[PDB]
Amino acid sequence: STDNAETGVIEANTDTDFGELAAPGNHTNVKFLFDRSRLLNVIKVLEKDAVFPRPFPTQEGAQQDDGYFCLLTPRPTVASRPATRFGLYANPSGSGVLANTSLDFNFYSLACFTYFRSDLEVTVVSLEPDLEFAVGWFPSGSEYQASSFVYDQLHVPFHFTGRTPRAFASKGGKVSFVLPWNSVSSVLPVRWGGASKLSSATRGLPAHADWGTIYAFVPRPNEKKSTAVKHVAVYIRYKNARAWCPSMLPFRSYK
Amino acid sequence: STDNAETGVIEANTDTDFGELAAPGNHTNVKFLFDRSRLLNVIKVLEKDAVFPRPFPTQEGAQQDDGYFCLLTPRPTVASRPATRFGLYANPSGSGVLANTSLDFNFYSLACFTYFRSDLEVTVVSLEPDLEFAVGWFPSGSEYQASSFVYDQLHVPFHFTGRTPRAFASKGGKVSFVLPWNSVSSVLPVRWGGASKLSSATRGLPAHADWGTIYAFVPRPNEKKSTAVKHVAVYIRYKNARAWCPSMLPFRSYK
Amino acid sequence: RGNNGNMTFNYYANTYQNSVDFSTSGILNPLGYLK
Amino acid sequence: RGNNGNMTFNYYANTYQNSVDFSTSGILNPLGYLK
Amino acid sequence: RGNNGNMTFNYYANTYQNSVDFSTSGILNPLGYLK
Amino acid sequence: GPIPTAPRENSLMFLSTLPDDTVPAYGNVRTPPVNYLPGEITDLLQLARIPTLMAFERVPDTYVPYVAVPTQFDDRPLISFPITLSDPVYQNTLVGAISSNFANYRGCIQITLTFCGPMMARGKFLLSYSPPNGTQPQTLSEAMQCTYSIWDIGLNSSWTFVVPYISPSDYRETRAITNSVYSADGWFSLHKLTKITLPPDCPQSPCILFFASAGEDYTLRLPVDCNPSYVF
Amino acid sequence: GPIPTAPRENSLMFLSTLPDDTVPAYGNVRTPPVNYLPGEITDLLQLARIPTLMAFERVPDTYVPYVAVPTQFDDRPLISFPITLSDPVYQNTLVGAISSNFANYRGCIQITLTFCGPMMARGKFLLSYSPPNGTQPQTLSEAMQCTYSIWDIGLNSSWTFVVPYISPSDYRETRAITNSVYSADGWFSLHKLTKITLPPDCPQSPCILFFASAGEDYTLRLPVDCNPSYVF
Incomplete structure (x- = not known):
């Protein structure tokens, strides 16, 4: 029919040309679609007080504990820090240390807007049989407390106690709870183009776009360290999500 | 008494010839009869990302993973695919690969109509002692996602996460949930006579007459594969069932 | 109706319990x- | 609203269940x- | 009647709890x- | 605060026939309407009330569903069978097939006959029903005393014989193992009262078709498991 | 006193899509208002209703989103493609990208065209839509019988062609594997009815742009998992 699509705003079934007005029969709603769990990352389990990674760039011969901790955000991250370029180690054995990375494939498969906001609901699942553990979390912009104290000649890491929530699960159990949107920024920028500092900043790297941080540890004294490593899984959900402006979608190769 | 049964529609107790009108005393109702569990099939348990079977005919020397997965339908199936002729391997040791098969004996013992429809309620029971597992399912017409990703040098199969429901059961536990009728066809044809494609089709083989697909896997990384096999049992139930036209019943031999 | 005994309280909503045409x-x- | 089925009883208060502007x-x- | 103590709430229906002539x-x- | 509770002795149990629902996993799904399909079924008794055919051994497969009248007879019914629903003759009828999957039944069985032969023939038959006894009645003289009726060939070639329900218990078992009074309920037989007159040029030997079904006050009570023998 | 209870068979289970909440851990937190941000989204159909561009293989990357009219033709449509949403041509359009993450769809697809060339040219085109058949129609004579329309170059250079929705089932699958009648829905083609008259001094070979989107009665039903292939 007559129209002018160069103007952009085109008009708007078969009743117009030849109709059929098939009756309705809301599964695409933003609030409904995003309410379901999905894996985020897999992390080790602590057995003593750890040293948080230093900010980049990290020089050779720097002592720290890497592989633990994990942010709560869909945007790409590296070494438990915000990042922009997603990457992976597809190459064979090399040298140095390998940096853990994460990303929300399912979220970005339909991330067709710019700004987002919702509540987060976290849960944790163990992997090794009959494993006992616990979880700890702190808000954005805070810091992880190091060092340990002595009780009856046993070194208890400080992270056993704090004003932030703690969770103890029975042998072979699971954890779950819901946290509030606590970042300073009003909404989460899916893609950004600003700078966080007046000088020496990196374009397009947001500062406090997340929900917090999480870690896992065993309720034992530091005098009972073991050798075999342990692992833990993490899942997240979104509650009352909202979107605020259109955007693009990931490109699909034509190979 | 006088009657004419050649006409088909015959009239209709002892009050008519000699009566007795014994008072009533609804156990045959369609809705009530079909609400009870019954075994469907027994399947293996995955321990890594698998390759779905290829469509028939499968040539010699084709690499795949067979014996897992299982449809949700009373109609006969072979190799986790819809089928028409039910068969079994009563012969002794032979060659090649043996194709798993299934059928609902109890359903077909009273399947005296053509069209059927109801909701399905699935549950899972383990067989080996102290076994830990999980279940996954996807609708009709979908596909199973393959491949795996690396987390801290551990290969985690992709099926750990997805928009479709997942179920994690404690050590030596059980699972249960109810799914909705989701196939495109309005009703389930107990016996069919059409064709699904314009050419190269097979008469009497329906396309999407089922409820979905199910599989079982262990929450462990691919780097901890074992040797001994494991097994799982499946049961199903029907809710608010309905039937739509008369039919025949299975033949009984006179031997 | 059906092999259902409970007749006092339904927790989840009907739309989330059963399909509707x-x-x-x-x-x-x-x-x-x-x- | 949302993928929520319960429609009979909310135990914890709204302020402690969800954030409020x-x-x-x-x-x-x-x-x-x-x- | 009988060695039954509960006197507040019967969950399942009477027909599904006891036989009836x-x-x-x-x-x-x-x-x-x-x- | 927390509400005190006490789990019972049968916690974490799985019952295959528990009358209760389960939590939904993928709810909020709509389906296309089915108001266009006619002939919805509600109770299997509707199908049970439909006539069907029986079987007979025939002279030495051979299971023709009809009985042929011989020429000369000898003081004996043409065909007789018990009234036990597990009998072979009831195997393929709808009533027998459905009842085999239930324990108890109640009501009146219904039997219907039909003639197939030359139009201009004539004859008379006698139908009998004998409750349980020490020995199965054979002679026509015995048969006459019990409940019976006389069928006359005429314009209408079909007749229905209703078997009354008499038993010492309200319900009765559906399959017989010991042949106790609770399962067996006597016998049925057919006797040729007269000699059939075949008109000239009509060759010989008419045939009779047996039609069986359930009465208007039939009923079944207890479901049971099935026999998967038909798959082999 | 304690209230008797009986835990069910599915206790201590974790469901990834259970419609229920969880206990709060750090509640009683306020947040800044967001009433200053305009353009809030409510349903992804709003984005699905926006036109976008398609792709084509081009002569022997080469995936220009337009088709160039040749000089001489041979009894064959300029371009044709199926109506299966899994086809490559629909990959990058918003409708295709969104639908690929759902199982069932329903409604009318919408196609829009636009001309790019010298103002003082003229011509006429024919658009066709052929439901499923044993062989894809090729000749203009065949095409004419099916549903079609005629496009005339004039003041307005854009035209919209609405593909009717006809199928034996209320819903249809979104991705095709066996090409059954439940997924495929025929073909679309473009035929040059006349010969385009290029005015003098205007060099040659105009081009046509393809615009696709969703109709006003589109719909999607069942969510599914995604493909992370774009990360590699």
């Missing part, structure tokens, strides 16, 4: 009529 | 108007 | 009368 807007009948 | 005191609109 | 439509009597 979308609108398009004793005594037993015999399956054969002979005019 | 502090006061400063079918039919789908189109995202483009052409005067 | 279908219709066909202190002071103690002595077991012997002598006219």
